[PDB]
Design a protein around this nucleic acid. Structure first.
Ligand SMILES: [Mg+2]
Ligand code: NA
Ligand code: NA
Length: 324
DNA sequence: CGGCGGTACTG
DNA sequence: CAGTACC
DNA sequence: GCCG
């Protein structure tokens, strides 16, 4: 339903997030995702508490709003939150850096540009501040995947390239492009990055690099910036991971998401004494009282996403049924 | 009381 | 290592 | 923040 109330909680959720109160912000995270997944809206301090994810304190405020239209917290929110959100929206900069800059008296991107000490990643983020905030129509996401897949098969017709993330989940727009590159023969994917990177660099397709350790042939991922030729083109974020065919499934699942999906999913295997990762699904995982993995385990074979759902006692769910 | 996902670069 | 990032 |  999307109640004007939850629309007032997200205002807080983001507040505690940017302020670095991850856990509390996480609490407001699921309580909102619940009120957003409600068939028809409620108006009782009880019926609400009933709803899974919504705790005592949560409903205590719901009343106030619905009931009133007022929310005490919203008015006592530090006049720092917006500036922290501004700063935190710079790629490479998080809550920690944001609070540091604010503490140093920084209040705008102007101030950041002239006086702030930036990392190479943040300098790039600031450079495309607006670009990194827009989404692209999926049609263009396709053109970018196609562009990488072309440069990939360009030297190995066996290379399998796919576009994951929100794309594979069937969204109209995309925040970036997440390309997965593997190889059925389980070996031909070895030490290829620089080949492709240098290829896409030839096409002038890549504009900037954020994360790319290529001096080490074991590089797993590439996060960078690209831009199609022609006018009206904007810079877009491009992520690329190359995994061996053996972990393809788990990689595909991971890269498809959503983020809340993998967390919730991995939390499930966690209970069943199992462990899931972009690499593989393990069973008989040894952990201590603090949930820390003390002993690895057996990597169950999983050549298809279905196998993962299956092994986790879960019914398969299409990429579109993962958008949560 | 205390976990809340599992992992890959950067400097 | 802490920070930040990918989903 | 919630929840075991
Ligand atoms: Mg994406
Ligand atoms: Na950021
Ligand atoms: Na991405």
């Amino acid at each position: 339903h999307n109640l004007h109330i939850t629309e007032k909680l997200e205002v807080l959720a983001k507040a505690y997030s940017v302020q670095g109160d991850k856990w509390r912000a996480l609490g407001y995270a699921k309580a909102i995702n619940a009120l957003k997944s409600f068939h028809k809206p409620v108006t009782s301090y009880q019926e609400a508490c009933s709803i899974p994810g919504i705790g005592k304190r949560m409903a205590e405020k719901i009343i106030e709003i619905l009931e009133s239209g007022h929310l005490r917290k919203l008015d006592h929110i530090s006049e720092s939150v917006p500036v922290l959100e501004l700063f935190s929206n710079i790629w490479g900069a998080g809550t920690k850096t944001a609070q540091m800059w604010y503490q140093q008296g920084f209040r705008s991107l102007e101030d950041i540009r002239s006086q702030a000490s930036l990392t190479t990643q943040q300098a790039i983020g600031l450079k495309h501040y607006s670009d990194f905030l827009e989404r692209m129509p999926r049609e263009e996401a396709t053109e970018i995947e196609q562009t990488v897949q072309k440069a990939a098969q360009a030297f190995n017709s066996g290379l399998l390239c796919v576009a994951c993330g929100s794309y594979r989940r069937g969204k109209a727009t995309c925040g970036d492009v997440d390309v997965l590159i593997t190889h059925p023969d389980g070996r031909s994917h070895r030490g290829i990055f620089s080949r492709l990177l240098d290829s896409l660099r030839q096409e002038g397709f890549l504009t900037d690099d954020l994360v790319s350790q290529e001096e080490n042939g074991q590089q797993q991922k590439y996060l960078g910036v690209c831009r199609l030729p022609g006018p009206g083109r904007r810079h877009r974020r491009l992520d690329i991971i190359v995994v061996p065919y053996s972990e393809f499934a788990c990689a595909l699942l991971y890269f498809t998401g959503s983020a809340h999906f993998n967390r919730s999913m991995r939390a499930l295997a966690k209970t069943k004494g199992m462990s899931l990762s972009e690499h593989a699904l393990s069973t008989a995982v040894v952990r201590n009282t603090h949930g820390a993995k003390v002993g690895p385990g057996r990597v169950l074979p999983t050549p298809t996403e279905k196998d993962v759902f299956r092994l986790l006692g879960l019914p398969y769910r299409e990429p579109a049924e993962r958008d949560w």
